[PDB]
């Protein structure tokens, strides 16, 4: 199976440099060129350039010539893109993908690069239980509130992913260099609080893993 593996996120202070990686698996590495694409909200997609796995020869988008440096290790089947002198304008998601025939048929999951002077902060996770008394109808909605973290991303599941139906995870919102994310889950009243429902929040940037069980009020 063909897959491209790259880190989920990278935090880097302005003016500094970071090196993104792309580990290829499941195909003859030298056969396909390795392209890098930039995705930023508002700017859309931008082809950064490619690297030749055979000779290590790069071809750049003229715009990214002084910004990005493309290198390759054929032995380990891994491509590298070094972004130097980073600004807030370089905060985006960086994909690596292969051209398997004048087409980007195989992409990576993309590396979310955040450029900020703000400090890494562990999230506070709060269980959101329904108001006291009964609950409307035969269905109950529970919530989970992740507050005051930096940077992106966080991962929120319900019962370790066992509970996926009726789940709405809302995109984080930044305020004063701190993110706020929330999630809801609607289950039948016959299942809660009869069966335990726990929200699982992970913030790899601060090495945080918090499980919060939703207890009735």
């Amino acid at each position: 199976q063909v897959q491209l593996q790259q880190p989920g996120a990278e935090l880097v202070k302005p003016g500094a440099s970071v090196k993104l990686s792309c580990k290829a698996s499941g195909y003859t590495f030298t056969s396909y060129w390795m392209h890098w694409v930039k995705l930023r909200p508002g700017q859309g997609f931008e082809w950064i350039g490619d690297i030749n796995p055979n000779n290590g020869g790069p071809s750049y988008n003229e715009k990214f010539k002084r910004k990005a440096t493309l290198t390759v290790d054929t032995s380990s089947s891994t491509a590298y893109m070094q972004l130097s002198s980073l600004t807030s304008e370089d905060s985006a998601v960086y994909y690596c993908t292969i051209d398997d025939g004048y087409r980007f048929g195989y992409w990576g999951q993309g590396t979310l690069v955040t450029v900020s002077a703000a400090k890494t902060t562990a999230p506070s996770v709060y269980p959101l239980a329904p108001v006291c008394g009964d609950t409307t109808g035969s269905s109950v909605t529970l919530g989970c509130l992740v507050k005051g973290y930096f940077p992106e991303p966080v991962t929120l599941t319900w019962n370790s992913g066992s509970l996926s139906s009726g789940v709405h995870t809302f995109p984080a919102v930044l305020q004063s260099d701190l993110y706020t994310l929330s999630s809801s889950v609607t289950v039948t009243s016959s299942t809660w609080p009869s069966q335990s429902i726990t929200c699982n929040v992970a913030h790899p940037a601060s090495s945080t893993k918090v499980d919060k069980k939703i207890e009735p009020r």
Partner: protein
Amino acid sequence: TTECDSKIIGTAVKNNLAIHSDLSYWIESRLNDTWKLERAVLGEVKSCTWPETHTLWGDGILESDLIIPVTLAGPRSNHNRRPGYKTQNQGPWDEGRVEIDFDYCPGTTVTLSESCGHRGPATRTTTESGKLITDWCCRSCTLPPLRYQTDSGCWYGMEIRPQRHDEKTLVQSQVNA
């Protein structure tokens, strides 16, 4: 790294036919539906750079899209292109004389399938023992297939792999340009 001798060179396009040539090379692209490479005769594979002064249609070109490698005196030209095929760095360039065109090798067939192997070194249609390989395939190429012809036999483009992935003694290109 070095540039070819431009004393023995001639490039000309007239009507629907375009030709980049010298004493050894004869690279012909034709307009039928679209402009694409039709046939390249390489009397002896060179290792120099084709001068831009004698290059037709060389605006904004990514070298990986050029059928004949620029390091092998391939023109940086959109005429040096063919739909469904990337640069042929691993073609039979060490066989001396080589002729590229787009047709089927005798007794062979090429099929489109995502199951087919990814592009590799150019494989000859006959084994070391001389046995013919009939069933070939490709993932995202176009037809008729890219075909090499050398003094030792008939070859297919890098994109084209033997459908029966299970061939024992393959004759494949060992050069990487």
